[PDB]
């Protein structure tokens, strides 16, 4: 049952296919420092031959604080989409936050992200939808696997059957998520087999019962990647810094961005052999 | 504990008598509204609670594109006016998008934050700034120690009245619990706000591969029993006269002739512990 | 009709319809005179207040997270201060068994016994227990779903013991924590013939550090969490308390302090007294 | 170093660093024959396939839901059985202990005794096992978080068993349900001073109808969990199949079909060997 979709030239995801790298930085600060880590992500990329589809927000609409950051915003964010495709040649993916941002994004970005809290939101998926680009949809911490079909039926109901599943993790307790790894399988089946991708980084956030910004568990990162590379999925989403430390959101689960490499190659390694080995038919 | 004014003779606290958010889930039709309205505002008459009427005017987050969505704005704006006109009774609705804030707040008296949408700060703050009394929905996936970011947005805005409802917290795929240790935790984080429990939605469960809500209404008593007895500001409840007819939210729809009979429960339990005394226990 | 009740003594009946029975004492048997003191205050504020009472005490916590933890003075000494805390107050009492040949023993001196939480799935423990001729207090694993209760109903009825209850602890909520479904006391109930519930508001309130060696929990919250579970409409209340919760040798973090014992129950009387005369509503 | 390596048998040793040994087989022991002829199997592929190889059964299922489940042929039966396999094939066979006296007899027999998931607290238990003087695989609870390990291996260390391997099942995930949180298995090492971590697919799969009798599970996902489990680089992998899962007395809806023993081993190999020849990353 499998779909692939198609980003852009010599980029397609599909759960059979070799994965997607949709690999970049947590939030848009500035034009130079996002062309800068992007070149490194490009650079790494074009070295191991891994499909690359560079990622930032332009705003974080759902900071826990009034106070944290939440990036340069619309306007400059789209400007800064625009170098980094000019200059690269790298197809991006950024998330949405409401329906009237939906068509202007879509002039830029090659892939529209639904926010995991917003997946149910009924005239914010259809407006992405209606953008006209593939659509990655945040599997939301609240969300069981069989139930992302009902957001993919939105889309499919105006016309985009481009449509992507991203795993971020499963509220477990207070304050925590876990990865049911089985999920994978279940989101792929009862969609017709939309490419389904895997957020490591969020899926490694935690919090403290009074903080007032995420908590985070970077160092567990490989652990985590292996784990459902090894699944055999269309797609890791993944967020870097250079020293994650001084990040301005989702620091604590930022990769530091010189193991960009020593991670990818495992990536690639795992992917490559488990992308050659047969499915068995359990019954 | 900080007292939330509401309307003439309606003020919400946490140890004040309960106030009833009572009515039903969704706008259909004026007629249908007025009558139900009509109920509650009888029951709660005769027994002496006070009461805001509840209605959505748009289920935004529907599980499946082709589930009932309500009558929209513009006329349930309008259905609203006529409640109001009619009962001298306050309206609570949900607001879904931030430019909705200020027409809704020129006719409802309570605005809240859906659920799903608490930690998205230009609604909040849009809702905060429309200067009504603010029911924040705790998300399933927001632990009750959180709540004071999203009080903390509204406070920003210059809007200290915010009143908190607890809708269930994630248990496993598909199902709620309801953990009665988080009113305190709400409350004590929060600088005293209201608290108020949605014992309607807590009800909540689905099948892993159902296209609309499940729900446990049999149990409505059990939970909110439960609730009232803890010591809090408000109950929030939805009901229909019959709910496998209910076009959202059946499963867990208190049926309406049932109304007064667990009115009177939660009316003699809510009594009884509002005066009896906290335990500092140390 | 729809709900059983299990008489435990002269005077003490527990059952769903009926008003409440305390459970309550300490967590852990250390030594007869405390053992007589702590007992002796619950007596007198029951005494007081007209609530049916049952003495509870550990002679043993034979699952301690640390090898190096209080364990108790054990089942020889644990029964002779069960048997002085009967003969000076005429009260009955409930402990927990840990193995399958400490049922008979236990069950010539103590009037109620309890599966321990963990061990409840264990078939030889369970038939054991039952085979003893005591009501049995079931502690309801943090594992195990409310409406699954009824397999270990079954292992008691198998044997012949019909006089079974079911104490709610809590379910496991993440890692290192618990809540209250209090949706699960109708769901025991129900599914099993009527058989009591209890609630342990106590254990409930467990939690932990990740990294902790012994259990954490929050009994500044315990009114909160007991005023929630009195109100639904339930055959019992189990209650630890110590004089000083933090010098408690095991689960101190969740003890009532002793001297507040009279301020707790008469609020559990009072609401279950009104709950207990309001009907069911029947919604379909 | 930051990994300890359990001998087991010659030609057998589990490490987080090593290749993954599989401690493979059946729930339950039923009858000589069809032991020795499943394991046959198992000996079959993994000698083939080049994987170190511990046969696994139960000779009792001492915590069946139902008293009407069937339990297998007993202690005094099940240890012919396993000297049988050890005799026939030259395999070293694990199995599970219930209770403190079973510890000796079985460990005269056994090459690996392995403590229950909800025994697992049950310090006389442990210790009785511990003592035996074999290798230890603790069963991680449901109930239990992965930093909580640690005091089971001391109680183990305590009384001079050092050789302790520590084997995941799932964390409860609401009623009725597991998650296997893939985070855990690198805490279970960190924080025993590097035990091999084993990842039990089988008991993993489980989860259950809320009225059934008898457990349910997901044996058609046993691959990608088994495989994602693999990659993160793991001691063992702890697996149970049958010919025709359907008709297992316990466990067949979480069971590997036996004919795709082969299939199944040779990923995890393949997976294996890679992942062993990669390197951590010092990620701060
Ligand atoms: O940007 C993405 O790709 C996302 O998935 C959204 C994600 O970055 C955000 O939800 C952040 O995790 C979030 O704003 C951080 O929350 P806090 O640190 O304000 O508590
Ligand atoms: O109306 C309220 O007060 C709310 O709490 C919002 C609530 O009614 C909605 O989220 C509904 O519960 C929801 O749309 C039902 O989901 P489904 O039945 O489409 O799966
Ligand atoms: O005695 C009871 O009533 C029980 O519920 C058993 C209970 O007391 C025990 O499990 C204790 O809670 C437990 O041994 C203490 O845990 P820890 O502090 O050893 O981690
Ligand atoms: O034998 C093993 O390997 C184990 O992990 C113990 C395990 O087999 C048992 O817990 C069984 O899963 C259990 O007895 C079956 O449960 P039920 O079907 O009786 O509900």
């Given at each position: 049952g499998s779909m692939n979709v198609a980003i852009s030239p010599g980029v397609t995801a599909g759960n059979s296919?070799?994965?997607?790298?949709?690999?970049?930085?947590?939030?848009?600060?500035?034009?130079?420092?996002?062309?800068?880590?992007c070149g490194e992500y490009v650079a790494v990329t074009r070295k191991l031959g891994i499909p690359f589809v560079f990622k930032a927000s332009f705003d974080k609409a759902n900071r826990s604080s009034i106070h944290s950051y939440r990036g340069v915003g619309l306007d400059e964010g789209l400007k800064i989409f625009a170098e980094v495709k000019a200059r690269?040649?790298?197809?991006?993916?950024t998330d949405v936050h409401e329906a009237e941002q939906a068509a202007p994004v879509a002039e830029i970005a090659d892939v529209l992200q639904v926010?995991?809290?917003?997946?149910?939101?009924?005239?914010?998926?259809?407006?992405?939808?209606?953008?006209?680009?593939?659509?990655?949809?945040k599997k939301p911490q609240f969300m069981s696997?069989?139930?992302?079909?009902?957001?993919?039926?939105?889309?499919?109901?105006?016309g985009?059957?481009?449509?992507?599943?991203?795993?971020?993790?499963?509220?477990?307790?207070?304050?925590?998520?876990?990865?049911?790894?089985?999920?994978?399988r279940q989101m792929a089946e009862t969609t017709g087999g939309c490419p389904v991708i895997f957020d490591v980084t969020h899926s490694l956030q935690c919090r403290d019962p009074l903080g007032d910004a995420s908590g985070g568990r970077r160092r567990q990162?490989?652990?985590?990647?292996?784990?459902?590379?090894?699944?055999?999925?269309a797609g890791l989403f993944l967020e870097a810094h250079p020293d994650p430390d001084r990040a301005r959101c989702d620091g604590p689960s930022?990769?530091?961005?010189?193991?960009?490499?020593?991670?990818?190659?495992?990536?690639?390694?795992?992917?490559?052999?488990?992308?050659?080995?047969?499915?068995?038919?359990?019954?």
């Open positions: 296919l070799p994965f997607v790298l949709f690999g970049g930085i947590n939030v848009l600060e500035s034009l130079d420092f996002t062309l800068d880590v690269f040649g790298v197809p991006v993916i926010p995991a809290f917003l997946a149910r939101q009924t005239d914010l998926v259809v407006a992405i939808a209606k953008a006209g680009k593939p659509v990655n949809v696997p069989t139930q992302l079909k009902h957001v993919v039926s939105k889309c499919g109901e105006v985009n059957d481009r449509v992507m599943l991203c795993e971020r993790g499963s509220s477990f307790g207070y304050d925590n998520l876990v990865v049911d790894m089985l999920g994978f990162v490989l652990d985590l990647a292996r784990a459902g590379i090894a699944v055999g999925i930022a990769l530091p961005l010189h193991q960009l490499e020593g991670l990818l190659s495992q990536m690639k390694a795992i992917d490559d052999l488990v992308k050659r080995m047969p499915a068995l038919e359990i019954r």
